[PDB]
Write a protein that binds this ligand. Structure first.
Ligand SMILES: Cc1cc(NCc2cccnc2)nc(N)n1
Ligand SMILES: Cc1cc(NCc2cccnc2)nc(N)n1
Ligand SMILES: Cc1cc(NCc2cccnc2)nc(N)n1
Length: 330
């Protein structure tokens, strides 16, 4: 089997991406944020505290003939940014892009943080990191990809995020029309439950490539590119008037600037992030200070190749017995 679904940025600056997912029978379609940095599939629901719902579509298990309470099960997740949610669990039929999983754990939110509530376009999360990070207790649950894997033509999914445009998530096949050149595969460590890999270095604009190992994760859930402070300083030093602002919490640049590209290594290959991709717009409406897309990881504890980096590539998440990542230009 395979599946193919379009993923659409929620706003004009690609602050996040949503992908329609069918849950239940008859289908309830919710727009979920596909997250390769977490492992829970959770949704706004008929159980979510009413004051914490502001425009999201909700899952109503009582309206699904295939829903079953996973009795006793609970979940609770705190993401790096201090965003949180928690609740109980149902199993139901979930379909993404024509690929169906029966008995998928669908984690129903009872509580969500204000950040989730205000994000009216995002009805929940679909985690695609390793199932060892799933937060369901007392019986940990599998991701949609782990449940689908045995049925797929190839045990892979691919992320093809657009710049200011829709893109695609495919499951079970590699669309050889979706990229240019060849895919360069690189080793993954699953020790922390993430798609963790080592980049071979970076360049700023037209500058020389610096060969240096940068461990990090491939995380569609994260909007920006978080790298060591040395790398990030080297980037923003090439932008007149860029600075790190404690008041904003990281790098801002003049909205009159033209940003340089950023290149990252994947083995002997190179992925170029155009400068435009690193411009996340005014820090407040009308401001002439714009929010940088490359930020320091130093206050995180991990480097994160988030959407700013991933959208520059066709990315293969190979879930073979020995997982690997693949990157191609596009
Ligand atoms: C899931 C998601 C991410 C995101 N990132 C950009 C962001 C983060 C914090 C402050 N200002 C902008 N923005 C939204 N709306 N949803
Ligand atoms: C995948 C994902 C979504 C999310 N949504 C909440 C949110 C955060 C920032 C701005 N607006 C909303 N928070 C996180 N950490 N990951
Ligand atoms: C994405 C983005 C927006 C922006 N807005 C500020 C602006 C520009 C032009 C006219 N009036 C206001 N500046 C930049 N550089 N990038």
């Amino acid at each position: 089997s395979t599946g193919s679904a379009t993923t659409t940025p929620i706003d004009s600056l690609d602050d996040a991406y949503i992908t329609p997912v069918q849950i239940g029978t008859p289908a309830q379609t919710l727009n979920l944020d596909f997250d390769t940095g977490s492992s829970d599939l959770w949704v706004f629901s008929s159980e979510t505290t009413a004051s914490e719902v502001d425009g999201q579509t909700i899952y109503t298990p009582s309206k699904s003939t295939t829903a079953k309470l996973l009795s006793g099960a609970t979940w609770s997740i705190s993401y790096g940014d201090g965003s949180s949610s928690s609740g109980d669990v149902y199993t139901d039929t979930v379909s993404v892009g024509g690929l169906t999983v029966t008995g998928q754990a669908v984690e129903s939110a009872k509580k969500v943080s204000s950040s989730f509530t205000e994000d009216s376009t995002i009805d929940g999360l679909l985690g695609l990191a390793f199932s060892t990070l799933n937060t369901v207790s007392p019986t940990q649950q599998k991701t949609f990809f782990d449940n689908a894997k045995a049925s797929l033509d190839s045990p892979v999914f691919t992320a093809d995020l657009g710049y200011h445009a829709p893109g695609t998530y495919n499951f079970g096949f590699i669309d050889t029309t979706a990229y240019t050149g060849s895919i360069t595969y690189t080793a993954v460590s699953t020790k922390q439950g993430f798609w963790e890999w080592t980049s071979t270095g970076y360049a700023v604009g037209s500058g020389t490539f610096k060969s240096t190992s940068i461990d990090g994760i491939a995380d569609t859930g994260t909007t920006l590119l978080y790298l060591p402070a040395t790398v990030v300083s080297a980037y923003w030093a090439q932008v007149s008037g860029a600075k790190s602002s404690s008041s904003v919490g990281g790098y801002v640049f003049p909205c009159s600037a033209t940003l340089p590209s950023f290149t990252f290594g994947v083995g002997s290959a190179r992925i170029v992030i155009p400068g435009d991709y690193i411009d996340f717009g005014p820090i407040s409406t009308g401001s002439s200070s714009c929010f940088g897309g490359i930020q320091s990881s130093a206050g995180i504890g991990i480097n994160i190749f988030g959407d700013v980096a991933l959208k520059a590539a066709f990315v293969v998440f190979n879930g073979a017995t020995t997982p690997t990542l693949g990157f191609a230009s596009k």
